[PDB]
Amino acid sequence: LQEALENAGRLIDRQLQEDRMYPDLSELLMVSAPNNPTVSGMSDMDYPLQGPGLLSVPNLPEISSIRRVPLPPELVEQFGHMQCNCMMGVFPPISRAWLTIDSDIFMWNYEDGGDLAYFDGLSETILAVGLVKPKAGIFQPHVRHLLVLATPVDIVILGLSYANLQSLSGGMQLLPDPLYSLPTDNTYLLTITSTDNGRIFLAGKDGCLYEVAYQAEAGWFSQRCRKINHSKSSLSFLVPSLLQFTFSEDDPILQIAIDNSRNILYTRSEKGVIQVYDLGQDGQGMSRVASVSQNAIVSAAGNIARTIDRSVFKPIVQIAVIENSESLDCQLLAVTHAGVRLYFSTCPFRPNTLTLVHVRLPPGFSASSTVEKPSKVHRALYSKGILLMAASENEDNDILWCVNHDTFPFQKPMMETQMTAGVDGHSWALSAIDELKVDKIITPLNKDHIPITDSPVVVQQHMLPPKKFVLLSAQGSLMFHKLRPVDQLRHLLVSNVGGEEIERFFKLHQEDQACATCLILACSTAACDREVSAWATRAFFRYGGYSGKHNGICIYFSRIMGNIWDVPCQLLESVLQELKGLQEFLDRNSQFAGGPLGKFHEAQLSEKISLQAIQQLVRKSYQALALWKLLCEHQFTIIVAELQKELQEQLKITTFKDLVIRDKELTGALIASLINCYIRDNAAVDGISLHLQDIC
C-alpha cells in the first residue's frame, strides 16, 4: 500500500527524530532542580593519564594532539628586541597566531610558518590586539576580519584581507587605516570581544565596558575614532566607593564573553563579578541590567545548601558562554582557579536574575602517576581541592585538561568523555571552540536547532569534520582535535587488532551506536583503511545484535541525510559516496552481509526485507543526487517564461522529502526542460539515460 521508498523514508525520519530526541543540556542537567547535586562532581569523572609524550595515544580521548609548529627565527629576533611589552595570542578565525612587541604589530600564520606580515607604523605600545568582524558598509568586501590595537596614546583599527595563498589556510593581506587612532581613556584595555554583526565591546584594567567605533572624519562633537562607556553601573549611589576610596576601588575586569542568541555579554573581573548585558532594539545601545559579584556567585553556591566558604577562598579564572541553543535557562560556564566549571543561568524578572545551578569539578583521579593506575568510581559526592584541581598545578608546566559532553550516556546525563592532555610548556591561550570558532554563526558547535539534540557529536560525525583546537604556548602552537565516537571507537577496534572488546562498545553504545559506528568503520573507512573496516565488517556481523544492526543502519542513512532530509556539491558527492559505498558494502556482502541472501523461519526474512528497503532507499537517494547533478545539468532562469511558471516553481521544489521518497513525475518534467533547453553539448542523451536508470 505504501511503497518501500516511502516506508524507508519513514524509518529514516523516525531515526532522525530519535537522534534528535537527545536530551537538552537543561534536561541533561535537569536544571530545574538547583540543589547541591545540580552541580556535578568528579566522582563520576575518570581522568586517564598516560604521560606527556607517551608513544601510545589513549584509546578513549576526546582530543588528540595532531601537530606543533617550531617558532620562527625572525619573530624571535624582533620579539627579543621588544623593550617594554609583549602579549602573545591566537587568532583561530584566521588560522593565525599573535605576539606583542613594545612598538609594532607583525602577523604570521602558524599553520605555514610563512613570512611574517609586518606592521610597525604604530608609535605606541599595544596592550592587546583583537580579531573582530568588520562593520558592514565600511570596507571593500574582501575584509573578513578587523584588527583592533590599543596604545597608551591611541587605539588603532587595521583592515584585514585573508585571501588564501599557495584549504590549508587564508593568506592575509592588511589594509592601511590611516586616521583611526584615539585614546580610549586613561583606562588600560586588556579584553576584546565581537558579536556576529560586529559590535565591539571593550574592558581593560578598569571595570568599564568600552565600545570602539571608527570613521573617516575627525570632529568637533566626536573624535576621529570614538568610544563610549557602556558601564554605567558605578553611578556612586549608596556607599561603595564614591566618597571614601576613589572611584571604584580596583574594579579589575579580567575576561569578557558574548552570547549572541540573546544579545548577551558576560563578564569576569579579577574580583569575579559577573554582569549580563542585552542589546536593546536600537542595535547600538547596551544597557546593564544586572551586576552580580563573585561574592554573589559564592553566596549562591553556599545557598545551594552545601558549604561554599569551605570551598572559599575560590576565584573564578575563566568564563565560557552557553548559548540559548546550548541551554534554555543556563547561560554560562565559569572556571575557577581550582579548575571548577560553574554553570550559570540568567533570567529576567520582567535577564533580571542569574543563578548558580550546576558545577563540573575537575577529576577525582589523581594524574599523579603517568603510568596506568586502576580506575575508581564514586557514587557519593566526591570532591578535591585547588591544590590538585587547579589545571596549572605546577608553576613551570601547564596541564591541559580536555572534556566534552558524553553523548552516549543518556542513562548518565552528567557523564562526560574525559581525557588527560599532557604538555611541557606554559599554556598562554587556547581558542575556545564555543567562543571564536563558531563566531561566524550564531549557533556554537551544534547538532540541531534547539537545546534538545544540540550536543550529540555522534549524530554529526559525518556532517562536519571533528573540531580541532589550537593551544597557544610561549614556544609554538600545538593542535588538539576533538575526537569523534567513530574515531575513538575505531581506535578502540584497533585495540583488539593487537580481547573482550566489543562489550565495552556495548556498555557505551547500548548495542545501537556501536552498530552504527561499526558500519561506519566498515563502510566509510573501507576506502581509507582496508583491514580496520574489514575488522568492522566481521565485527559488525558477529556483534551487530528489532536488532541493533538494522537500527544502526537507520542511524547511518539518517545521519547521511541530516542536512538534506528536512547542499554544496562536495557534500552531495560525499553523501552519494557514503550511500554507494554502503550499498556496495551490503551488495558485496550478500553471503557475508546478513539479509541479502535468501529468527530463521521469518525474522531472517524480516532482515532481508529490511535490507531490501534500505538498499532501495539508498539507490534512490543515489539517483536523486545524480538527478540534482542533472539539475546543475539543467536550468531555471531561462525557464522563467515558457514552461508554466507555477509548474516552474513546482519544478524548483526538488529537494524536500519528495526528492528522497516521493515524486519523479516532476523529474520527468525536468527531463523535458532539458529536452527543450539543450544548452549543454552531447549531454542530453546521457542525461536522459541517467533518468532511465533513475526512473524505469
Curated annotation (Swiss-Prot):
GO terms for molecular function: structural constituent of nuclear pore. Its main location: nucleus. Keywords: Atrial fibrillation, Disease variant, Disulfide bond, Glycoprotein, Isopeptide bond, Membrane, mRNA transport, Nuclear pore complex, Nucleus, Phosphoprotein, Protein transport, Translocation, Transport, Ubl conjugation. It is found in: Nucleus, Nuclear pore complex; Nucleus membrane. Interacts with GLE1. Able to form a heterotrimer with GLE1 and NUP42 in vitro. Forms a complex with NUP35, NUP93, NUP205 and lamin B. It is linked to Atrial fibrillation, familial, 15: A familial form of atrial fibrillation, a common sustained cardiac rhythm disturbance. Atrial fibrillation is characterized by disorganized atrial electrical activity and ineffective atrial contraction promoting blood stasis in the atria and reduces ventricular filling. It can result in palpitations, syncope, thromboembolic stroke, and congestive heart failure. Belongs to the non-repetitive/WGA-negative nucleoporin family. This is Nuclear pore complex protein Nup155. The lineage of its organism: Eukaryota, Metazoa, Chordata, Craniata, Vertebrata. The chain holds residues 19 to 863 of 1391 of the full protein.
